[PDB]
């Protein structure tokens, strides 16, 4: 959480495949999701992981991303298939958690992933 550096984003064509990547620094953490924002929208979930493995999705992007965590590499990933216009915009990932007994969010930078048509 302390750091969080995204990589993954690109240029890639309708039906494309990405692979972003969320690094956190080092190793009280809960859940880390994924987030974007499209060019003058709110940001939106993507999707999320708890601690414990448990996956929730956009209705936008189910089945064609996936959200998994490499504890042994402390790397978050966000796998995305069957890529569409849609889904350009800056991704974000947070990761949240708690130091006592106090709640905090920690953002990466923003990644830039752009489907062309």
């Known amino acids: 959480q302390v750091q969080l550096v995204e990589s993954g984003g690109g240029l890639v064509q309708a039906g494309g495949t990405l692979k972003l990547s969320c690094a956190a620094s080092?190793?009280?953490?809960?859940?880390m999701a994924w987030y974007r924002q499209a060019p003058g929208k709110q940001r939106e979930l993507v999707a999320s992981?708890?601690?414990?493995?448990?996956?929730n999705y956009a209705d936008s992007v189910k089945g064609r991303f996936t959200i998994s965590k490499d504890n042994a590499e402390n790397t978050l990933y966000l796998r995305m298939n069957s890529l569409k216009p849609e889904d350009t915009a800056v991704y974000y990932c947070?990761?949240?958690?708690?130091?006592?007994?106090?709640?905090?969010?920690?953002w990466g930078q923003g990644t830039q992933v752009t489907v062309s048509s």
């Open positions: 992981i708890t601690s414990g493995g448990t996956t």
């Open positions: 947070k990761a949240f958690f708690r130091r006592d007994y106090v709640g905090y969010d920690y």
């Open positions: 080092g190793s009280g953490i809960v859940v």
